[PDB]
Design a protein around this ligand. Structure first.
Ligand code: BCB
Ligand code: BCB
Ligand code: BPB
Ligand code: BPB
Ligand code: BPB
Ligand code: MQ9
Ligand code: HEC
Ligand code: HEC
Ligand code: HEC
Ligand code: NS5
Ligand code: UQ1
Ligand code: UQ1
Ligand code: LDA
Ligand code: LDA
Ligand code: LDA
Ligand code: FE2
Lengths: 273, 332, 250, 323
């Protein structure tokens, strides 16, 4: 149950809250206060999902859907079967995401490593708050949030986009997609570069840091370097949501027209009209 | 750049589907003010004396009306169509029976068109109905018309830049974009779908798998048809100042039942109505109009959704004059 | 008839759906998850499971001679100055002496090879500027040589005497300093240095803790294991420089 | 804080390094220069670049494609440079609007598009050769070349393989900023909503997965930069505390972990799978599936919802309805 190098690292300490109370492992898993609160929010949320689903038309995993209230409930509570389950499940999701993040902090501290991972993980958490909390607050109803259903969430995304005629022209979305695309390509390049160095093939010798830099110097005339590509990777991945969030928040509260029309700022300048 | 909050939002679909209208209050307000310029109904007059078919010399459409009723109609017509030009726009001041002036015969046709709309297209216009004002808004030339090529500005009351002019070839893409809510879709959905009944708007297969015999090579509609339908839908949306979810659940554009709102059925009737108006009332008017009214291919200006709706989901927010002017339809 | 339709109301896309999950699961479970076990296995507590989870060994042919095979048996000889805090199996351990010197917890180093890391031409990769004379500091950046090193207790720990550059990547990795009052030199990774115009701030350890930084065997070169020993000592400070640091931050 | 993970506090300068290839050493041109500000967040050295036949051919074929597109775009604005600058995002080079099947379309309706596609393809293939052959020259495995082949393959899928499979060039992707975007919707409309295509799901899931993984991997390496985690090659051939800690971070968080080598296999695989999944989806579409939503309904997957406003019968199918 322990990696052969693991025991020396399995020391006491590093917590944010709780100290020795929850400072232990269950199998490979560190617990900690935030492990305990994670488990709690997860159990609660999954139980509410199962129960809510049981009251609905289907057990098919793809078609199950737990939906927020009608717009007219604004920011108040809704009957359980009319959005209330959705409200409670959202609160549990947040609790679980935030615990998971804070637990990652404790794990980092115990290992004497940077806190860069939980910090990165704040980005999708923040994105979730944009969709489910901040935009609905700005619009005045919980009902603008997305439903919990594997395919139904996509119907929401779909309708949300077409409410603005063509969502592809949303500058936040263009930015977001560009970062998604370049990030996916860069992860391929980074993974392939490293593998190509450690696995030349045919009994050949493993290459070097110098070969690494030579490769991209040759192919594109520049090489960012070994540490920097990791900083770059984090920056590109992060900016998928950090810029996408602006496009999401803008739609409704800061723009009610179709997105293509927004580009009128450029097209309609009197000079070239 | 942006529109400051709050946004007015409605719900047109089951909760959680992000379906409904998204409106900017200042814009809504401005449109209400423009549309509240609709002249009030004229005071009612009692039917009295003989029908104007006996009294006047050249009445072909409104013959059942009494003198006072008829002259009331003419007053409304003037308020609606040519309030700045007055009665003599259509009339020879010395011979009210004369058809010498082109607007006169055009207006008689328009009277038939208007009664046809209110009598035969109630599936669209319901008991709200239309008057000359609905399209004309107080000018002989309605502010929103289409030719057989895209024209800018959309509102012909605004002065065109040199690039907007239909003769400036470098301005074509922009003329096309602004008719399709600024998209780059390379199709004019007016000539394709609204001028006449030649083309089919639907493009989505009605089965999961491709039917052998309609799905290979030249048997297929080209993908251009799907861009074109998208163009039309962008244009319809902009014409009613709404978005796709006013009519559709985007889960499945092609489906009716729970997947479409009653507004979509009404829109479908509207396409049929527009094509009727265009093919049967408006296009044939090129024989009766001065050359200067015609498009570069000799066409008369025609109607689209914007012609009536002018950026609102019901024209003039649902204002009606139907019971005030029964002579405009429905005709028993 | 329909394109893609098969007997039994099956269709082609439907088959490709199963096929695609099968490729994904096969690659994830049978390939990747086994590649994940080229280090640290087998676990410690000959079961069938221990054989099934491992991939076939692979051999790396090293750029400067010799080979490395993984996975391989690597039991950890070194006695650990650690004790159970409780009988429970997932209970943490606690240091029985000085955890920094004893090298446990976040102060642990790995049993890396006692080998000097090399450039592509076989030279020592990580070397002080006194040796790497063709290397310099970019103009616009602080020259830290001569600056004091200030520890977490705000006391001067010593004086910067050199910088260790990575010749293969053109990147400084260590500062070398003279330790005040200890008649010895010490390396510190740049990652533990806050470089200012007038000083180097080190929050990882206290001033008196510089006395026990692991020592190199040679003055002008460093082994892979020494790099680990040196880095690990400061990382240990993050949790152990004061008794307070292991305890709940809030 | 490890300030090194944000930017380089003290930059080093030294003689530029040249790694000798099996061939092509004499095709490196340029004298490298250095940027001080770039050296904060990357290597300072820019250039030199490798030329070679493959790279030159790639520029030759690539420039031709670009000239064909720009020229047709400029025709679209009747060669007015001001309107060109203004309307640029809206301008495009289109595949045939009419249905000619697989017949070579006339130049004014798709012909030029096809030429552009051809030259783009040759450009991509030539560049592929450079990518592949630089790795052989430097004694490196072919990993990047396979990933790039998959990206190229996807481009051929949407460019010509899918058009060939349904037998219509009208289905190809237009060249242009907005026009290539409009295609996305047109395609989705034609094939019954791509959110109901499982291969969209797979491709997006792996794309988001690339997001998660690069964020996680990028942060993990930064979090262990203090132990030299960034020197990944020697961490592979000689495990250091950096990667022991990285592995344990993940093991204690999610219950399992990778190695420093295998995390790159995971990343490479996810990236590959974005393109593989997308390609498979495109090859299935029109060929074997006509409407994805209906296909999901057929297989019992599609969610359904109560009416909100009244349900709305198709008026076209009503008794008495006009056409
Ligand atoms: C017709 C409508 C469309 C649309 C509508 C749309 C909308 C409305 C929005 C996007 C947005 C976005 N779209 Mg777009 N889109 C995208 C790509 C993207 C993403 C880059 C981006 C952000 C996604 C997101 O917010 O995730 C969010 C994911 C979250 C919050 C997950 C967080 C993780 C969580 C913290 C942890 C969860 C843990 C699990 C519960 C635990 C599971 C336990 C197990 C695993 C152990 C592409 C590539 C395309 C293409 C190729 O066409 C496309 C087309 C379209 N989009 C259509 C045009 N899209 C968003 C955007 O940024 O717009 C500017 C957005 O709002
Ligand atoms: C603004 C736009 C958004 C969007 C748009 C979007 C699109 C367009 C697509 C997905 C798809 C997917 N989304 Mg959605 N999404 C999902 C979850 C998912 C998965 C069902 C699937 C694969 C995603 C993936 O592999 O990521 C990368 C993460 C990886 C690889 C790690 C493993 C993730 C694991 C598969 C997630 C499992 C989720 C569980 C089924 C649900 C929670 C389980 C709980 C009850 C225990 C979550 C948990 C959330 C949260 C918490 O916010 C979210 C938010 C959003 N999605 C936004 C609303 N998403 C794809 C799909 O197939 O839908 C059917 C798809 O095409
Ligand atoms: C999931 C995995 C993904 C993935 C994978 C991979 N993607 C790769 C590779 C891998 C593995 C490589 O190995 C290869 C490479 O090398 O990386 C450094 C490459 C590539 N990915 C490019 C673009 C890209 N990838 C995208 C997407 C994804 N990719 C997906 C997501 C996207 C998106 C989504 O938009 C884009 C735009 C290029 C940078 C490059 C193409 C080669 C080329 O470029 O061929 C064309 C070559 C040319 C030379 C034409 C250009 C010439 C013009 C005229 C330049 C003239 C300017 C000049 C300075 C002026 C002087 C004029 C003078 C001549 C008179
Ligand atoms: C831009 C940067 C990004 C980024 C980055 C990072 N991402 C991270 C991390 C970092 C750094 C971690 O460090 C952390 C981790 O450990 O990695 C192994 C993590 C994680 N990324 C997950 C999913 C994920 N990342 C996504 C996106 C991005 N990641 C973007 C790209 C997406 C999508 C769809 O985009 C998904 C689905 C989990 C695997 C994991 C959280 C575990 C958890 O929180 O456990 C605690 C909670 C649970 C185990 C379940 C809780 C169930 C609730 C109570 C009830 C369910 C409610 C739910 C709302 C219903 C949804 C229905 C659905 C159909 C709509
Ligand atoms: C309304 C219409 C929509 C629509 C349409 C479609 N969505 C598609 C497709 C279609 C048709 C596909 O065909 C493809 C696919 O999977 O089919 C099965 C695809 C995908 N959707 C993903 C994401 C997603 N979808 C969403 C939604 C919607 N999807 C809605 C439904 C959403 C959300 C949130 O809603 C998300 C997040 C991607 C992961 C995935 C791969 C794309 C990619 O990664 O492209 C990028 C890949 C490249 C650019 C290759 C480039 C590499 C070359 C080598 C570089 C050459 C450049 C060189 C410089 C050349 C020089 C220039 C030259 C002129 C000389
Ligand atoms: C009713 C009910 C459900 C409630 C009960 C709740 C329940 C499940 C708990 C039971 C109680 C238990 C068992 C104990 C409590 C203790 C506790 C806190 C346990 C938590 C249990 C729990 C919630 C587990 C879920 C874990 C989880 C979210 C896993 C998701 C894993 C996913 C899908 C990962 C996505 C990313 C991905 C594809 C990773 C694969 C590659 C990996 C491993 C990368 C990590 C990694 C990276 C990134 C490196 O850079 C690296 C560099 C050098 C060396 C190693 C690594 C390395 O390993
Ligand atoms: C929009 C053009 C138009 C305007 C403006 C207009 N009319 Fe008329 N007028 C007509 C048409 C058309 C007819 C014939 C109606 C028919 O055939 O039923 C007509 C018929 C008449 C007749 C019957 C003449 C006859 O003996 O045949 C009179 C009188 C008349 N209008 C008066 C007026 C007055 C008064 C005004 C100003 C308030 C006015 N008109 C403004 C179009 C117009
Ligand atoms: C469906 C919208 C619509 C309605 C309703 C409508 N019109 Fe018209 N009208 C048009 C269009 C389009 C034209 C052609 C453009 C033009 O010639 O100004 C036109 C042209 C005219 C003209 C000639 C204008 C000119 O000088 O060229 C007159 C006169 C006229 N209509 C009168 C009427 C009258 C009277 C009514 C009410 C009975 C009416 N219209 C109702 C759309 C409409
Ligand atoms: C005002 C109501 C209305 C709005 C708003 C609207 N549509 Fe439609 N749409 C219709 C009608 C009606 C039809 C059917 C036309 C016919 O059959 O003649 C249709 C047809 C379609 C079709 C073809 C369906 C098939 O069976 O092949 C698509 C795709 C579509 N619309 C997409 C959109 C998009 C995208 C938007 C927003 C950009 C939009 N619609 C907005 C009413 C509307
Ligand atoms: C039998 C026959 C004759 C042989 C078959 C011919 C053949 C192989 C045809 C193949 C055609 C193919 C693969 C077509 C695919 C086209 C695709 C995917 C186009 C997609 C997008 C195109 C875009 C966005 C082009 C935009 C063009 C411009 C902005 C102008 C060009 C200038 C640039 C700087 C382009 C760089 C784009 C970006 C990095 C900013
Ligand atoms: C492993 O290190 C890597 C580099 O430096 C050696 C790169 O330059 C690159 C290429 C990135 C740029 C911006 C040229 C990648 C992908 C990489 O992984
Ligand atoms: C002609 O080239 C163009 C630019 O370059 C100067 C732009 O910046 C812009 C504005 C867009 C961005 C993303 C800055 C447009 C629309 C454009 O067409
Ligand atoms: C697929 C397009 C074919 C165009 C040919 C491009 C020329 C490539 C020349 C190969 C380079 C020879 N070398 C040295 C790598 O072996
Ligand atoms: C983004 C698209 C994802 C849709 C995936 C739908 C797969 C349908 C085929 C499997 C059906 C299995 N079943 C009966 C449990 O639903
Ligand atoms: C839609 C993309 C799906 C890609 C598959 C996701 C891979 C994560 C699974 C990790 C497997 C965990 N484990 C320990 C059970 O092997
Ligand atoms: Fe890496």
């Amino acid at each position: 149950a322990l990696l052969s190098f693991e025991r020396k690292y399995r020391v006491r300490g590093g917590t944010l809250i709780g100290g020795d109370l929850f400072d232990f492992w269950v199998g490979p898993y560190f617990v900690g206060f935030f492990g305990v609160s994670a488990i709690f929010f997860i159990f609660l949320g999954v139980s509410l999902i199962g129960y809510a689903a049981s009251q609905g038309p289907t057990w098919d995993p793809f078609a199950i859907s737990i939906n927020p209230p009608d717009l007219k409930y604004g920011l108040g509570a809704a009957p359980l079967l009319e959005g209330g389950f959705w409200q409670a499940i959202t609160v549990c999701a947040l609790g679980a995401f935030i615990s998971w993040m804070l637990r990652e902090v404790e794990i980092s501290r115990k290992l004497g490593i940077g806190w860069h991972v939980p910090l990165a993980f704040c980005v999708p958490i923040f994105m979730f708050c944009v969709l489910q909390v901040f935009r609905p607050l700005l619009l005045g109803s919980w009902g603008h949030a997305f439903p919990y259903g594997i395919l139904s969430h996509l119907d929401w995304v779909n309708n949300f986009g077409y409410q603005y005629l063509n969502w592809h022209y949303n500058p936040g979305h263009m930015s977001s997609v560009s970062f998604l695309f370049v990030n996916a390509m860069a992860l391929g390049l980074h993974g392939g570069l490293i593998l190509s160095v450690a696995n030349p093939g045919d009994g050949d010798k493993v290459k070097t840091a110098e070969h690494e830099n030579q490769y991209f110097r040759d192919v594109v005339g520049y090489s960012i370097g070994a540490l920097s590509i990791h900083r770059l990777g984090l920056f590109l991945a992060s900016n998928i949501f950090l810029t996408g969030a602006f496009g999401t928040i803008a739609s409704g509260p800061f723009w009610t027209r179709g997105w293509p029309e927004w580009w009128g700022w450029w097209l309609d300048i009197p000079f070239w009209s | 750049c942006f529109e400051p909050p709050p946004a007015t939002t409605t719900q047109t679909g089951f909760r959680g589907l992000s379906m409904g209208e998204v409106l900017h209050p200042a814009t809504v307000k401005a449109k209400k003010e423009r549309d509240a310029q609709y002249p009030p109904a004229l005071a009612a007059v009692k039917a009295e004396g003989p029908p104007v078919s006996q009294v006047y010399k050249n009445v072909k459409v409104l013959g059942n009306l009494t003198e006072a009723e008829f002259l009331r109609t003419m007053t409304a017509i003037t308020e609606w169509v040519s309030p700045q030009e007055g009665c003599t726009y259509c009339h020879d001041e010395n011979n009210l029976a004369s058809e010498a002036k082109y607007p006169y015969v055009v207006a008689r046709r328009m009277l038939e068109m208007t009664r046809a709309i209110n009598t035969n297209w109630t599936q669209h216009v319901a008991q709200t109905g239309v008057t000359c004002y609905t399209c004309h808004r107080g000018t002989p030339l309605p502010p929103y018309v289409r030719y057989l090529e895209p024209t800018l500005p959309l509102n012909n009351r605004e002065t065109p830049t040199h690039v907007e002019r239909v003769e400036t070839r470098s301005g074509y893409v922009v003329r096309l974009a602004k008719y399709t809510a600024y998209s780059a879709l390379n199709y004019d959905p007016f000539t394709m779908f609204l001028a006449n009944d030649k083309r089919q708007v639907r493009v989505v297969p009605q089965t999961a798998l491709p039917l052998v015999g309609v799905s290979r090579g030249k048997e297929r509609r080209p993908l251009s048809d799907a861009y074109a339908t998208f163009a039309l839908m962008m244009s319809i949306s902009d014409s009613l100042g709404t978005n796709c979810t006013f009519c559709h659940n985007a889960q499945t554009f092609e489906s009716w039942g729970k997947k479409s709102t009653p507004q979509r059925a009404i829109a479908w009737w509207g396409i049929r109505m527009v094509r009727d108006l265009n093919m049967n009332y408006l296009a044939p008017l090129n024989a009766s109009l001065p050359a200067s009214r015609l498009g570069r291919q000799g066409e008369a200006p025609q109607a689209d959704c914007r012609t009536c709706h002018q950026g609102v989901t019901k024209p003039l927010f649902g204002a009606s004059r139907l019971k005030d002017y029964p002579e405009l339809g429905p005709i028993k | 008839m329909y394109h893609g339709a098969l007997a039994q109301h099956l269709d082609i896309a439907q088959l490709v759906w199963y096929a695609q999950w099968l490729v994904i699961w096969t690659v994830v479970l049978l390939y990747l998850r086994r590649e994940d076990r080229r280090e640290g296995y087998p676990l410690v507590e000959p079961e069938d499971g221990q054989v099934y989870e491992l991939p076939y060994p692979k051999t790396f042919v090293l750029p400067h001679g010799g080979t490395v095979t993984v996975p391989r048996r690597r039991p950890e000889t070194r006695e650990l100055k650690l004790a159970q805090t409780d009988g429970f199996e997932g209970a943490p351990l606690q240091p029985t002496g000085n955890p920094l010197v004893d090298a446990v917890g976040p102060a642990s180093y790995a049993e890396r090879a006692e080998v000097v890391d090399a450039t592509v031409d076989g030279k020592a990769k990580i070397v002080p500027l006194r040796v790497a004379t063709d290397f310099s500091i970019a103009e616009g950046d602080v020259d830290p040589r001569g600056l004091p090193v200030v520890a977490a207790d705000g006391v001067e720990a010593g004086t910067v005497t050199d910088l260790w550059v990575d010749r293969s990547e053109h990147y400084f990795r260590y500062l070398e300093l003279s330790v005040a009052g200890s008649a010895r030199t010490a390396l510190i990774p740049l990652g533990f240095c806050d470089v200012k115009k007038d000083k180097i701030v080190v929050t990882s350890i206290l001033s008196d803790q510089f006395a026990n930084v692991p020592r190199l065997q040679s003055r002008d070169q460093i082994t892979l294991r020494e790099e680990d020993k040196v880095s690990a000592y400061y990382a240990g400070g993050l949790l152990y420089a004061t008794p307070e640091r292991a305890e709940a931050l809030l | 804080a490890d300030y090194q993970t944000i930017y380089t506090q003290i930059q080093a300068r030294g003689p530029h390094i040249t790694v000798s290839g099996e061939w092509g050493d004499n095709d490196r041109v340029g004298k490298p220069f250095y940027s001080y500000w770039l050296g904060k967040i990357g290597d300072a050295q820019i250039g030199p670049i490798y030329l070679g036949a493959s790279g030159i051919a790639a520029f030759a074929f690539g420039s031709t494609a670009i000239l064909i597109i720009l020229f047709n775009m400029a025709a679209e604005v009747h060669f007015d440079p001001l309107q060109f600058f203004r309307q640029f995002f809206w301008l495009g080079l289109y595949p045939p609007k009419a249905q000619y099947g697989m017949g070579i379309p006339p130049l004014h309706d798709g012909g030029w598009w096809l030429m552009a596609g051809l030259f783009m393809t040759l450009s991509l293939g030539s560049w592929w050769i450079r990518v592949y052959s630089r790795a052989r020259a430097l004694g490196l495995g072919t990993h990047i070349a396979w990933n790039f082949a998959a990206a190229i393959f996807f481009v051929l899928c949407i460019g010509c393989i899918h058009p060939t499979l349904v037998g219509s060039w009208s289905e190809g992707v237009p060249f242009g900023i907005w026009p290539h975007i409009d295609w996305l919707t047109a395609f989705s409309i034609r094939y019954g909503n791509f959110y109901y295509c499982p291969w969209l799901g797979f491709s997006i899931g792996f794309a988001y997965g690339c997001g998660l993984l690069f964020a996680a991997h990028g942060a993990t390496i930064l979090a262990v930069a203090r132990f030299g985690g960034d020197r990944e090659i020697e961490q592979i051939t000689d495990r250091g505390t950096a990667v022991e800690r990285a592995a344990l971070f993940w093991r204690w968080t999610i219950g399992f972990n990778a190695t420093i080598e295998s995390v790159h296999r995971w990343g490479w695989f996810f990236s590959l799978m974005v393109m593989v999944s997308a390609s498979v989806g495109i090859l299935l579409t029109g060929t074997f599936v006509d409407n994805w939503y209906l296909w999901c309904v057929k297989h019992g997957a599609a969610p359904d919802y109560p009416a909100y406003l009244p349900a709305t019968p198709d008026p076209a199918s009503l008794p008495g309805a006009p056409k």
